[model samples]
Target chain A: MEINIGIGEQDRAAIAEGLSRLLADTYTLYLKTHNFHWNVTGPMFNTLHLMFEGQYTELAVAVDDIAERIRALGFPAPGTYAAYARLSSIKEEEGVPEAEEMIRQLVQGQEAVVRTARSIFPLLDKVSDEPTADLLTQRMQVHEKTAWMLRSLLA
Target chain B: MEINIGIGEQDRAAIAEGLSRLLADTYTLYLKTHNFHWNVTGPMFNTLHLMFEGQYTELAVAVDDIAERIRALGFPAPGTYAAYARLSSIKEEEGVPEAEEMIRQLVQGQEAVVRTARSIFPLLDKVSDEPTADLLTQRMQVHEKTAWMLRSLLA
Candidate 1:
């Protein structure tokens, strides 16, 4: 069945590609968050622990929504670390850095996700994909703002 | 009492206020993530704990959506911690903390969820509101994710 929301097949494919990247970026971030929550320690322990809990939990749900949006576009949503690693622009972290390093890594992570979400804007604008546009717009706002906040912590 | 949408003035007011608070809680959560990811340390070391860093990275983006939706409704989204703390039911952490303390704080952070989300039910029920409903649904998804991810750390 063709999706005839005034979008051509090529455009739909383009939009879907963008969405797939969005899903990948989101899921990869989720995994990292969970990893941190388990391993976080030191001063400001209570604050960081509770904070990471709140942050990762949110990402966990968002990955599902992003993936579902991709699926709704009539594509198979990618799963697994391999799939995410391949699709995501964000790199997975190895041997954790110190606490300050963790923040810097996250700042980069948030910015990367924003970049992933923003890169899709052209496709969304071209096709007048309101929902995708809305999703991307929303995603960008969070990532950009978050990146700024994290950066400020360094300053 | 049952909540109605689009038809009740009182419900709308309540929903607006609830959305305001959600926006506040989310930003506060975002702030905490940067703080924790920057400060965390311990023996489990940095490897497994990068997960928390990842979680906060994702959240760094998620709150933007919640706040922007509030702004999309023609309301100003809260930006500063003072504003977020004032509006949010979630309490801000005081001073520096330890690593295990971070985990314990996040546990409560995860648990603090019921209040932040539950605040909106009356308005959602009353107006049959779609945007608020969507936000609420998404929020529940994120909160559930946070709780599970954080809980996994404890186990």
Candidate 2:
């Protein structure tokens, strides 16, 4: 009944807990990005519209990856809105901001994911989890690149 | 407020139900592929391991895209194991098959998803829902491509 994946239960639980935060942050960001895709308006309407679509679409995939890693680590992935709200570090945007503000906010959420992802490394290092480490590496790389792209539109 | 996405509630629900099965099939296959990724062993160990890793990782992203489409259509995306069991057409394997059998099984799973994706088209055709149609087109394209690649390994 026990998993012997070279990872102890406590270590796996700790890693999964951190990953749950990453998943929640990613899910929250996914929603925000998709909302901006629908509501974005201004001089850069076309660019932001298409850009937000790609960004959110990528986040949609990224959330699944993060959640599955948690599942692979022997934990249930949080799936509901309430769970995301409780576990996520990112705040939900109530007001639909302008085009530039949307970009700025997205960059904020993007880097926040980077932080959440980076935070898990120590736990993984303790257990020599190359798989989780690899997943987090890929995730941080994506969010970092995304934040850079979102910032380019501002300056 | 009614989502005036041109489709009626019943139509959206019908399409969503079909997408749900597609999503379930994808999710189930995702789990199986990831399992093979972990347990694969043979003379082709290095290659199959790398291949299965990529396949499952991509599935991780894909499950999100399908589930998000369900959400966009104003229905909840099924995320729990129990929900997947109820909706998925693909059966999970209890025993870890040999590396060759794993590839064959994956190919089978890949084609099954293609059929499920194709099955949703009749519903989309009636409502003029190009977004859902586009999503299915992309899904089928990937599954078809994956099936070809997996089949090539057999010969």
Q: Write the per-residue lDDT of candidate 1 for residues A12-74, one digit (tens) a residue.
A: 778888888888888787777677767767785676667667768888878878888777777
Kindly list the per-residue Cα lDDT of model 2 for residues A1-155, writing each as its tens digit. Answer: 57889999999999989998998898778767766765666689789879988987788677767877876778756654446678888866766678888888889998899999888898888899999999999988988999999999788
In model 1, what lDDT does residue B44 have? Answer: 52
Best by lDDT: 2
- Indicate the residue-level lDDT of A55 in model 2: 85
Chain B TM-score, one value per candidate, order as shown = 0.81, 0.97
Name the DockQ score for candidate 2: 0.05
lDDT of 2 by residue, B1-155 (tens): 46878888999899889998998898778767766765666688789878977887788678778877887887756654445678888866766578889899999998889889888898889889899999989888888898989889989
- State fnat for each of the candidate structures: 0.00, 0.00
After superposition, the stretches of candidate 2 with alpha carbons farther than 4 Å from their true spots are A1-155
DockQ of each: 0.02, 0.05
lDDT of 1 at A132: 79
